[PDB]
Amino acid sequence: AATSRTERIWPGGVIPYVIGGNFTGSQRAMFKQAMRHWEKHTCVTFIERSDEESYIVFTYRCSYVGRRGNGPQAISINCDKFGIVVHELGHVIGFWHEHTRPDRDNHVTIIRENIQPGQEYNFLKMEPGEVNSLGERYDFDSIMHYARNTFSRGMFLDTILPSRDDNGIRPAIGQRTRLSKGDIAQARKLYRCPA
């Protein structure tokens, strides 16, 4: 679910940041590891803010998707773990949730009756004008994919049911351990990274 909007892409692949003075040494080091994980695999670079008007700020307060412009934007951190921060950074860079891709019905079923009332909006498709997948296949392993029971109203009730592949296996969804091969390949296309 890559943003289609040029204005939301960070110019030059550079994302200035500030980390709040309230975070511990451990939390700061973790934010830097999550930033570095995106950098190592793409042409995005995170730099300490100097004078930029628009930048991300880590605050103990999901993130805005892409560059809002005209000012700072929060990356608002029990959600205090590396993979959660890599997911939020995916929002910063320009990705919506994978299951909201305009083509998602070919890949998952949303079980609306199992969603906590008032949370159904989290499962709507993005309008086709707002996402350009860049030719990339739907990615069940994306760091941006919800788990099977996100916003579920109860124990064992799924809100997302992935389609079986030709081997009859429903792919696992919702990992928060590392960028998938598809997240990397798609971010490289989005930022027009050199080969």
Ligand SMILES: [Zn+2]
């Ligand atoms: Zn999110």
Ligand SMILES: [Zn+2]
């Ligand atoms: Zn994707």
